Amino acid sequence: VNSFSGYLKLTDNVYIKNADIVEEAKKVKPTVVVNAANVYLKHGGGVAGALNKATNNAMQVESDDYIATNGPLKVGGSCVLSGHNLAKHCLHVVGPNVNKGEDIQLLKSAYENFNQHEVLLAPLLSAGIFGADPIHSLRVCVDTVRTNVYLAVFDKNLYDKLVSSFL
Ligand SMILES: O=C(c1ncnc2[nH]ccc12)N1CCCC12CCCCC2
Incomplete structure (x- = not known):
């Protein structure tokens, strides 16, 4: 039993x-919240901008030190950093950004990072400003992630379309 409420x-x-x-x-304070990151951990907009704003920019400060030490992530890769005031940990996962021409097949590799964590609160990878089809992202998620994932979909219209078209 966990504290996630109201999920389908x-x-x-x-x-x-x-x-x-x-x-x-x-509200939940999950062990892991997933960020829709880019390789530079520049949390400017979309989910990443929202999560970073909610940390009063502490996520960005931590991320800049991570990049200065380790260099950029890989597309399809991830790193674990602090969850600040939102979660125990933040798993920064880089899905392919279609608006940069990145290979959508890397979306499966991105979701594989979730399997290293027993339970996660997450957005649909590569959705939103990353330019992928969210219906496809949900399919890749379901067919790749084996651990327990609680997906938060901001847009009600999109949520209803995801549910109603789910096979
Ligand atoms: O739904 C979300 C989303 N999901 C969970 N938490 C969130 N926080 C802020 C936004 C947001 N996003 C993020 C990028 C674009 C999109 C998907 C595509 C349709 C418009 C909205």
Whole structure:
């Protein structure tokens, strides 16, 4: 039993809710919140900008030190950093950005990072400003992640379309 509330169950291990991941993170305090990161950990907009703003820019300060030490992430890769006031940890995962021409096949590699964590609160990778089809992202998620994932979908219209078209 866990503290996630109001989710629709899609499969054995994947759950979905129309929610603001920032508000869900602050209420739930999950062990892991996933950020929709880029390779430079520049949290300017979309989910990353929202999560970073909610940390009063502490996420960005920590991220800049991470990059200065380690260099950029790989597309499809991840790193674990602090969750600040939102979660125990933040898993920064880089899905491919279609608006940069990155290979959508790397979306599966991106979701594989979730399997290193027993339970996660997450957005749909490569959705939103990353330019992928969210229906496809949900399919890749369901077919790749084996751990327990609670997906927060900000847009109600998109949430209803994801549920109603789910196979
Ligand atoms: O739904 C979300 C989303 N999901 C969870 N937490 C969130 N926080 C802030 C936004 C947000 N996003 C993020 C990028 C674009 C998109 C997907 C595509 C349709 C517009 C909205």
